[PDB]
Amino acid sequence: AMSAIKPDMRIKLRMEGNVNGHHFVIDGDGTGKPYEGKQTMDLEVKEGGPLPFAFDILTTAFNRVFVKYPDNIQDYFKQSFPKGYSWERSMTFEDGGICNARNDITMEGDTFYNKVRFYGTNFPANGPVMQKKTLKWEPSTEKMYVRDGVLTGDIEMALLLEGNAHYRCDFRTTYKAKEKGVKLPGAHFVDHAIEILSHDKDYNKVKLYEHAVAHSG
């Protein structure tokens, strides 16, 4: 049988968000190569712009289907389709900032649909997020393992800032296939690299790119 996952897929996304009380809506239109672990999104703020905080804190919320998995590691996410899966994420920043995010991922035809919710709070008014001092996320390694019976990914993240410093964050994401029969994979790692390829001056429009590869170390 031919895989539910097609080698060239489109992506549709809407995020409803609130960071330090600032409400916003962002739409995404993208394409990706699931078996190459590559995807590109064009994002557009639809409400609440210009955003008064660093766009970078949102970008990892804009799907682990787009990972190049070797044949010796079980691919939980590609096995989650056609039905799909969802994830919940906590992001705990070094200065007390805290974000919680969720994505519900479904498939219709050649397109992944993403229903994203994003909540951030406790960011200091003088900190780099509210002051828009971020430059990029550094490439990262996500540790995939089963925690309390649920596939979980832990990441030590780092935002490069203006002025020779990093702003660090702990990610924990829980991943759940909609079909409860999908077998849990063995522990492994996923290397990520996310980058903004271009953006407007006020980040109303952003082009985003991610490359990810799975490995056993």
Numbering used by the authors: 0 to 61, 65 to 219
What does the paper say about this structure?
We systematically characterized the maturation speed of mEos‐derived PCFPs in Escherichia coli and found that, in contrast to pcStar and mEosEM, several variants such as mEos2, mEos3.1, mEos3.2, and mEos4b mature extremely slowly. Through a structure‐guided mutagenesis strategy, we developed a strategy to reduce the day‐long maturation time of mEos4b by nearly two orders of magnitude without significantly impacting its molecular brightness and photophysical performance under single‐molecule imaging conditions.
In contrast, the L93M mutant showed a drastically decreased apparent maturation time of approximately 80 min, a more than 20‐fold improvement relative to the mEos4b parent and better than any other L93 substitution we have tested. Despite this improvement, the maturation rate of mEos4b‐L93M remained approximately three‐fold slower compared to that of pcStar or mEosEM, both of which also have a methionine at position 93. As a first step towards further improvements, we sought to understand the rationale behind the observed accelerated maturation for mEos4b‐L93M. The only significant difference (beside the L93M mutation) was the presence of an extra water molecule in the vicinity of the chromophore, which is well ordered as evidenced by the clear electron density map at this position. This water molecule (W1 hereafter) is within hydrogen‐bonding distance of the sulfur atom of M93 and the hydroxyl group of T59. First, the L93M mutation enlarges a hydrophobic pocket adjacent to the chromophore and stabilizes a single ordered water molecule (W1) that bridges T59 and R91, subtly repositioning the catalytic arginine. In both computed structural models, the amide group of Q60 replaces the water molecule W1 observed in the mEos4b‐L93M structure, leading to a similar repositioning of the R91 side chain relative to T59. Significant acceleration of mEos4b maturation was achieved by modifying the immediate environment of R91, a residue known to play a key role in catalyzing maturation.
